[PDB]
Amino acid sequence: KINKQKIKNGAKKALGVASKVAPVVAAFAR
């Protein structure tokens, strides 16, 4: 009962969402 597609989803947006946080902290920090 475990969704294995999820594991790519979160891994794919781990890069996607990382680009939703990295450029922002680059504004929050400097």
Side-chain angles (χ1 to χ4, degrees):
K1 57 184 184 69
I2 293 179
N3 175 28
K4 291 301 184 177
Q5 190 69 331
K6 168 167 176 59
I7 292 102
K8 309 90 160 181
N9 279 267
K12 160 271 193 172
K13 65 118 183 170
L15 317 165
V17 84
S19 305
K20 269 54 175 177
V21 309
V24 315
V25 176
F28 280 96
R30 57 282 170 165

